[PDB]
Ligand binder design. Sequence first.
Ligand SMILES: [Mg+2]
Ligand SMILES: [Mn+2]
Ligand SMILES: [Mn+2]
Ligand SMILES: [Zn+2]
Length: 285
Amino acid sequence: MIKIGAHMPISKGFDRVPQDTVNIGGNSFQIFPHNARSWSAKLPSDEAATKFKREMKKHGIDWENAFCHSGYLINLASPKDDIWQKSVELLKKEVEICRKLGIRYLNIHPGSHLGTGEEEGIDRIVRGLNEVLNNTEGVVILLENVSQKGGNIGYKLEQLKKIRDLVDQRDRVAITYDTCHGFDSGYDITKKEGVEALLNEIESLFGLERLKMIHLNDSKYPLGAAKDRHERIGSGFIGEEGFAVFFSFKEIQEVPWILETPGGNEEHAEDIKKVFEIIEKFGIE
Ligand SMILES: [Mg+2]
Ligand SMILES: [Mn+2]
Ligand SMILES: [Mn+2]
Ligand SMILES: [Zn+2]
């Protein structure tokens, strides 16, 4: 029923990810596309990509439940042309990594304008997305909501809509909702009226079909804190009671839930168990 997993390490190879996912009790995952520390990234070898696909098949992982997260360096809103250009080129490479692996989705944070203006930053993001999308095929870019820190763009869903609606290939732009980033920004999923408002907002701005992933993160801080410090499920200010409200909506259950909570595979296995404990304890249908 539930589509759930975690951000998984790739350091031992992409092909380990399907088994590792099953081993933590998941049926979905997110991975980085590389471990580059600068502006160039290698492709997986032919052998590595084939082995990954083989393991995906062996473990029966639904390809609609497998996601890449773009690297930490890319910033399509940067007012520094160096950074903008290098970001565009690395994002193209990340799309090609996804395409080689068969991954259908590449999730990005829109960017930060570093205090040079939301409108101008949105236009730079759009320009960058057009350069990437118009020179690649297949892969859909997911825009993730973020916290309101520095010059970040995307702390309100309206900002994601402004970007998406300007991109040429808007069918290749969809949305990821991160519960911690959202909670930081005033999206109060701890009350049913807050979840209803969130869903109404998604439906109006994008259509619900565009919600492709939820990043399921508790928060170390209260509603509105703008801190971006994730917490283990049930251990933060969203809490067991808040997640029970969020989980109760069928619209939410339809979308994969990907943990980005503190820790590694073992903590994530515990968090998946906690999610099911919450569903059971609160009698969620
Ligand atoms: Mg070789
Ligand atoms: Mn996230
Ligand atoms: Mn975060
Ligand atoms: Zn993210």
